[PDB]
Ligand binder design. Structure first.
Ligand SMILES: CCCCCCCCCCCCCCCCCCCC
Ligand SMILES: CCCCCCCCCCCCCCCCCCCC
Ligand SMILES: CCCCCCCCCCCCCCCCCCCC
Ligand SMILES: CCCCCCCCCCCCCCCCCCCC
Ligand SMILES: CCCCCCCCCCCCCCCCCCCC
Ligand SMILES: CCCCCCCCCCCCCCCCCCCC
Ligand SMILES: CCCCCCCCCCCCCCCCCCCC
Ligand SMILES: CCCCCCCCCCCCCCCCCCCC
Ligand SMILES: CCCCCCCCCCCCCCCCCCCC
Ligand SMILES: CCCCCCCCCCCCCCCCCCCC
Ligand SMILES: CCCCCCCCCCCCCCCCCCCC
Ligand SMILES: CCCCCCCCCCCCCCCCCCCC
Ligand SMILES: CCCCCCCCCCCCCCCCCCCC
Ligand SMILES: CCCCCCCCCCCCCCCCCCCC
Ligand code: NA
Length: 270
């Protein structure tokens, strides 16, 4: 019975190990991830003056999100390289008992912190019509927290009890769907009575939001999307999962923030 290998990354690292390519690709994509957040941080700080005061809480939230994402993705990246070490005899990277083992906590903490801020920030750019700010905020914050909490619980069972992993994942997905429903309503209200240039940006924000947020459950399920004997149930699934999480992080935090800032500017023209 495998004792060293809590999550799929540790499981693969303790059994099959990672090829040089899988190890280096994953390290590099994780590094690109935190590097983009640092660049984003400087961007959101420097451009804060480009929007009217009434919208600046959004730019502020983007900056705070970047701080958390840079730190925690930096920590994630160091955790990757510290956790797996090369064996000369076999020629692959294996889980290093003298390391601390791969830990998903960094990313899940980042989500817990950032999800509520990302959801909140749009409410400082668009105006609602018939909904209340407090009601939308509360719905986003409760569902967002429950989504990440239930997903975190699920992740614990990814190796030891795939049933529990999938059931907690489905519970999390229920909260996710409710978030999508609320955000779609917010975007539709925000489009009312603004310029068509702003409306177009909001349409793009919705598509970005829908796609980028759905990448997360996709990455969560990735190693199983081809079966337990499938091609992804391997280092390939680890590489794909980490790639997709990184694409999702950049899109959902940085690109989303840039679009919101551009919306604010278009509202800053009429
Ligand atoms: C306003 C236009 C700003 C462009 C920012 C270019 C980002 C380059 C990131 C590398 C550091
Ligand atoms: C008109 C809108 C201009 C958009 C500029 C966005 C710049 C964002 C900078 C953060 C991403 C830089 C990626 C480089 C990391 C290496
Ligand atoms: C006034 C806006 C200037 C944009 C600078 C963006 C810097 C990109 C981060 C590297
Ligand atoms: C645009 C005014 C900003 C007020 C901050 C409200 C959000 C605080 C989060 C706690
Ligand atoms: C709210 C922004 C502050 C960032 C909080 C994230 C905690 C950083 C911990 C890094 C890992 C040690
Ligand atoms: C629901 C999200 C809970 C995340 C908590 C995980 C915090 C652990 C941070 C890194 C682990 C250090 C070893
Ligand atoms: C301002 C929006 C509320 C989210 C702040 C961070 C959430 C706490 C998680 C630890
Ligand atoms: C809602 C999920 C129900 C369980 C999924 C079936 C997969 C079980 C494989 C063992
Ligand atoms: C969408 C409603 C789903 C109800 C299940 C709630 C389960 C709570 C999980 C415990 C929190 C930790
Ligand atoms: C059809 C218009 C496309 C622009 C909206 C944003 C594009 C989605 C990006 C997906 C995230 C990865
Ligand atoms: C028309 C402007 C499109 C904005 C969406 C940008 C998403 C980038 C996809 C990579
Ligand atoms: C309906 C939303 C469309 C986004 C598709 C992305 C989900 C695929 C999972 C990635 C692995
Ligand atoms: C909430 C469930 C989202 C799963 C989308 C990813 C499935 C990828 C199929 C290929
Ligand atoms: C005029 C509308 C322009 C909005 C486009 C927003 C582009 C966001 C740029 C951030 C993408 C960073 C990805 C870097 C990976 C290398
Ligand atoms: Na290493």
């Amino acid at each position: 019975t495998q004792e060293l290998g809590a999550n799929f990354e540790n499981f693969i690292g303790a059994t099959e190990g990672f090829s040089e390519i899988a190890y280096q690709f994953t390290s590099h994509i994780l590094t690109l991830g935190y590097a983009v957040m640092l660049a984003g941080l400087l961007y959101f700080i420097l451009t804060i003056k480009n929007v009217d005061k009434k919208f600046q809480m959004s730019n502020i939230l983007s900056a705070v999100v970047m701080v958390s994402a840079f730190l925690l993705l930096y920590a994630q990246a160091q955790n990757w390289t510290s956790s797996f070490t090369f064996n000369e005899e076999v020629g692959r990277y294996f889980l290093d008992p003298s390391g601390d083992l791969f830990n998903n906590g960094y990313r899940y903490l980042n989500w817990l912190i950032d999800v509520p801020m990302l959801l909140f920030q749009i409410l400082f750019v668009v105006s609602l019509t018939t909904s209340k700010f407090s009601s939308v905020r509360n719905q986003f914050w409760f569902s967002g927290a429950m989504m990440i909490i239930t997903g975190y619980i699920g992740q614990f069972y990814e190796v030891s009890n795939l049933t529990a992993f999938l059931v907690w994942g489905a519970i999390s997905s229920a909260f996710f769907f409710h978030i999508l429903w609320v955000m779609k309503k917010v975007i539709n209200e925000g489009k009312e009575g603004i310029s068509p240039a702003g409306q177009k940006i909001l349409s793009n924000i919705w598509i970005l939001f829908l796609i980028s947020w759905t990448l997360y459950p996709g990455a969560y399920l990735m190693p199983y999307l081809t079966g337990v004997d499938g091609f992804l149930y391997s280092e390939d699934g680890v590489m794909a999962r980490q790639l997709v999480y990184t694409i999702a992080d950049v899109s959902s935090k940085v690109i989303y923030g840039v679009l919101l800032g551009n919306l604010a500017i278009t509202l800053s023209n009429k």
